[PDB]
């Protein structure tokens, strides 16, 4: 066993009844003085390194050609001047195993952390040396972390796409289904997770040109998509991951759910395609009143009204659907469907739950389209227009397929540096650059939506780490007050940066004029309610930083009205799974699953303590499963009120609790304004 492995395992060997957390630090030293420094490839100077990486097809030469070598040297020197040290063994291990650039045979390390950060910063700046240094300082301080696709692939010749998630709308036609399968394979080839809205597809037993009971429903398309994602599995490196979203009022909703039952037959079971359910407020109202609900056949509704079932408001059209004899429907028990959802989530963690009305009551771009589904991580909530892929030799009507670039603020590092504004603006600029340089030649709706919406996702990580390292319980009202203030600041500065980009470029996102940003409605709660901290401890935490007031929000509203906004969507809180290790941060705004996690790598086992875990903050690092899910819902709703897109909200459940407890948590989330629920992980 390696020396650093033994040093890391020495953490759990208690001394005087206490964990040896400091041993972890020793491990990193070993991991660098025995493996990383020996396995790294050193050159005489930076010129030889850059030339070797360029000619050997490791780096794209275009982004490096925008800078003179003196500027690149200055950027690299700025990166190395911080003398960044990984405080935990797992941070360095995760970076050098998942994100550091290696040779073709993967026998040596070509990229250090500073090298990777410098390359990403130079790609972000697009020829601006000062901007590149700003990005270097932002990432080496670990205030901002680009998503895994962006951080791993920026400036690389053998790179994939920098966009993490893609959302596709599938129209009710064989041509559209085949095009959706093709685009899903193309985007999984690019490495991104693909989500498909199957609510427009007509249910099982519908007519294909006057011959009835002909359609296979959404389950056949689900099987096709599952095989497509199995085939396109990132060249066999990462398993192809897809998501299917169906409205709960679709007739196939049961069969949909039956794809995830552990007793499902092979002709129905789907195993590589995640499932999500979109629940309008009408379904929750029907379940609450115990009135029997009706699921609908989408094609009959489309024939009668000319629009898809998910294209209009069910809260106002459900009674018209039920009373219409030309609309076909089936009777269901909404409470039984809710119990089935809870049982399925207990068994397998599926489906994702999207509260459609919670998303669309604060959605700023309802004029473009209502949000009808979410992404594979159930945090992207954007307007999408379905595409009409016609026959060959016929022009296709290209719609809008959602796609946003992810980037997370490290809350602990951002607040320690007292740089919410600067970090938010620089992250917005980096995400705007990632969107601008993204061009996908096989997904036309994705390309058009990227060019028009200009949507980005700016997330946050290390919420629980910051709260526990500052002596604040994650479930406490003080923690929710901090989240309210911090994310109001993040939203304020993201809107300010979006408006500044719109002013400097003279262009807004497409159809911005009909948005609530243009009409000023979006700023209502910000121009009437003060989001400054209500607790003295939180206010002290925010000292040295100008917390925006109602007057600052009014000025920002006027600025947006004058100049517009460059981005249709700005903030989305992704799960941030593996890149949180490198940043020494807790995953996303979720509470920690465990204080010390035991992970098996190779034939060895390693223990990763939570960042900053110690004796004095052991009980502030409360495990998520031990927490009240209602207070976690309260925290997520408090954050969500300042996030325009959704938050990947994983439910952390105990084995003792029943499906009724899961249903109660889901209904409280819906009541509190939670937009989406990601996972039901049971301990």
């Amino acid at each position: 066993v390696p020396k650093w492995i033994q040093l890391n395992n020495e953490i759990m060997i208690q001394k005087d009844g206490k964990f040896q957390f400091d041993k972890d630090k020793e491990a990193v030293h070993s991991y660098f003085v025995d493996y990383i420094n020996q396995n790294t490839v050193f050159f005489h100077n930076l010129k030889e390194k850059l030339d070797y990486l360029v000619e050997n097809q490791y780096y794209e030469e275009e982004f490096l050609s925008l800078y003179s070598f003196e500027d690149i040297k200055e950027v690299f020197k700025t990166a190395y001047a911080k003398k960044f040290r990984f405080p935990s063994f797992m941070s360095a291990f995760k970076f050098y195993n998942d994100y550091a650039l290696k040779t073709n045979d993967k026998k040596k390390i070509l990229e250090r952390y500073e090298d990777r950060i410098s390359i990403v910063a130079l790609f972000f700046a697009n020829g601006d040396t000062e901007k590149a240094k700003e990005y270097v300082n932002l990432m080496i301080n670990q205030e901002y972390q680009p998503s895994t696709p962006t951080f791993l692939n920026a400036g690389r010749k053998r790179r994939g796409e920098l966009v993490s998630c893609f959302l596709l709308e599938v129209n009710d036609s064989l041509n559209d289904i085949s095009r959706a399968i093709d685009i899903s394979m193309q985007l999984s080839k690019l490495g991104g997770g693909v989500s498909l809205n199957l609510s427009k597809l007509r249910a099982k037993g519908e007519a294909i040109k006057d011959v009835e009971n002909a359609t296979k429903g959404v389950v056949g398309v689900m099987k096709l998509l599952d095989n497509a994602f199995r085939y396109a599995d990132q060249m066999g490196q990462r398993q192809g991951s897809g998501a299917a979203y169906l409205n709960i009022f679709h007739r196939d909703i049961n069969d949909f759910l039956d794809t995830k039952k552990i007793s499902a037959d092979e002709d129905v079971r789907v195993k590589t395609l995640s499932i999500g359910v979109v629940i309008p407020d009408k379904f929750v109202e029907l379940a609450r009143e115990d009135k029997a609900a009706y699921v609908f056949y989408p094609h009959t509704i489309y024939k009668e009204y000319g629009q898809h079932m998910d294209e209009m408001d069910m809260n106002e059209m459900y009674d018209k659907f039920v009373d219409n004899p030309r609309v076909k429907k089936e009777k269901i028990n909404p409470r039984k469907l809710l119990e089935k959802l809870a049982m399925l989530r207990s068994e397998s963690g599926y489906p994702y739950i999207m509260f459609q009305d919670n998303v669309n009551k604060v959605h700023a771009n309802n004029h473009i389209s209502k949000v009808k589904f979410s992404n594979l991580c159930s945090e992207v909530l954007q307007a999408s227009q379905v595409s009409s892929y016609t026959d060959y030799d016929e022009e296709d009507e290209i719609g809008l397929d959602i796609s946003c670039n992810l980037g997370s603020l490290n809350i602990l590092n951002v607040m320690e540096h007292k740089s919410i504004e600067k970090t938010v603006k620089l992250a917005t600029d980096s995400l705007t650059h990632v969107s601008e340089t993204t061009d996908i030649r096989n997904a036309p709706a994705v390309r058009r939506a990227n060019k028009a919406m200009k949507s980005i996702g700016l997330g946050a990580m290390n919420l629980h780490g910051y709260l526990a390292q500052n002596g604040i319980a994650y479930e406490s009202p003080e923690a929710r007050d901090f989240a309210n203030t911090f994310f109001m600041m993040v939203n304020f500065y993201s809107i300010q940066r979006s408006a500044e980009i719109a002013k400097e470029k003279g262009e807004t996102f497409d159809q911005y004029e009909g948005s609530t940003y243009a009409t000023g409605e979006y700023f209502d709660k910000y121009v009437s309610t003060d989001f400054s901290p209500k607790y003295e401890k939180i206010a002290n935490l925010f000292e040295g930083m100008h917390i925006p007031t109602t007057e600052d929000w009014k000025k920002l509203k006027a600025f947006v009205a004058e100049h517009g906004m460059y981005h249709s969507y700005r903030l989305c809180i992704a799960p941030t799974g593996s890149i949180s290790y490198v940043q020494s941060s807790t995953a996303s705004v979720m509470p920690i699953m465990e204080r010390i996690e035991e992970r098996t790598y190779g034939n060895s086992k390693t223990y990763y303590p939570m960042p900053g875990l110690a004796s004095n903050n052991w009980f502030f690092y409360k495990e998520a499963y031990d927490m009240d899910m209602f207070k976690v819902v309260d925290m997520i709703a408090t954050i969500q009120q300042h996030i325009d897109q959704g938050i990947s909200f994983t439910l952390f459940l105990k084995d003792t609790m029943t499906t009724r407890d899961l249903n109660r948590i889901d209904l409280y989330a819906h009541h509190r304004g939670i937009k989406t629920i990601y996972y039901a992980r049971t301990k």
């Binding site: 929750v284 379940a287 609450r288 115990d290 409470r335 809710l338 119990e339 809870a342 049982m343 207990s346 068994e347 084995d655 609790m657 029943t658 499906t659 009724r660 407890d661 899961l662 249903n663 109660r664 209904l667 409280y668 009541h671 049971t682």
Partner: protein, 289 residues
């Protein structure tokens, strides 16, 4: 918790030798080299001799000492399969491939063979040591039985499966596959009966029974390596056979509720080719907060 389920699986797997016509094997048998024919004969005799011990002693002795009418019935069924089905099947394969004089000589050789005898007598010794109303001695015999069913047969099964996976000796390979499928379930079932005894013991007694099982496995394994080289070096297969022995040793341990002893290894692809949370209704007022 398990005997009726195993009863069902056992009786639905019932088969007879006559169902597989053997004569068409002569069309591939004639094309094998002398070393291949020699190894096959020796392996076959090894399996035959070990399976006879299991039919005459192993299964009936366990059926005798186990309490429970339903368990005795399942065990009787397994003993029947050894004596009435498996033994006749091995004899049929032999009579098809070799003349009477060759069969007698192979059995004379394998009967005198040091590595076959060592393992055969080790297993039989543990069956003979069972004492009335002593569950410890019964457990030790069950461990021996599981090791035979789930481990010791497999150095032998390798070769017929190797041919079967190549399209050679398909009729006898089909028979061997049916036999092997019976021995697999026999091993799992006896394993569950052993775990029942093991779980009734103190922690110190458990540790002592674990040491017994691992020590026995080690003795048998070291002899299997020698047995393997003795038979398979002449056809160049010993390295791959050794991987197959360890893989099956791990299955035998898992049948006894123990951890695998050997690291995971991939198996020869030719041989491979041959081979709820509590539902609680919503009570209303759960929609109001």
């Amino acid at each position: 918790d398990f005997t009726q389920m195993f009863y069902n699986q056992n009786v639905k797997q019932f088969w007879l030798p006559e169902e597989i016509a053997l004569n068409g094997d002569l069309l591939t048998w004639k094309y094998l080299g002398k070393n291949e024919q020699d190894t096959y004969m020796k392996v076959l005799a090894g399996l035959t001799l070990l399976d006879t011990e299991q039919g005459n002693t192993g299964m009936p002795i366990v059926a005798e000492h186990v309490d429970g009418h339903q368990r005795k019935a399942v065990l009787n069924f397994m003993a029947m399969m050894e004596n009435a089905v498996h033994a006749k099947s091995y004899s049929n394969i032999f009579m098809t491939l070799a003349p009477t004089e060759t069969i007698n000589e192979v059995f004379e050789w394998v009967k005198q063979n040091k590595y076959l005898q060592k393992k055969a007598q080790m297993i039989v010794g543990l069956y003979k040591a069972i004492q009335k109303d002593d569950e410890i001695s019964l457990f030790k015999a069950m461990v021996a039985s599981v090791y035979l069913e789930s481990f010791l047969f497999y150095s032998g099964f390798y070769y017929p499966l190797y041919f079967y996976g190549q399209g050679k000796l398909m009729q006898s390979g089909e028979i061997i596959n049916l036999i092997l499928r019976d021995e697999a379930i026999h091993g799992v079932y006896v394993g569950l009966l052993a775990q029942e005894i093991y779980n009734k013991q103190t922690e110190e007694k458990k540790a002592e029974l674990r040491e017994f099982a691992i020590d026995l496995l080690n003795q048998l394994y070291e002899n299997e390596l020698e047995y393997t080289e003795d038979l398979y070096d002449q056809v160049g297969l010993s390295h791959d056979v050794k991987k197959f022995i360890r893989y099956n040793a791990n299955k035998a341990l898992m049948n006894l509720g123990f951890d695998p002893y050997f690291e995971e290894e991939d198996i020869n692809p030719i041989v491979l080719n041959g081979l709820k949370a509590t539902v609680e209704p919503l009570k209303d007022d759960d929609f109001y907060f």
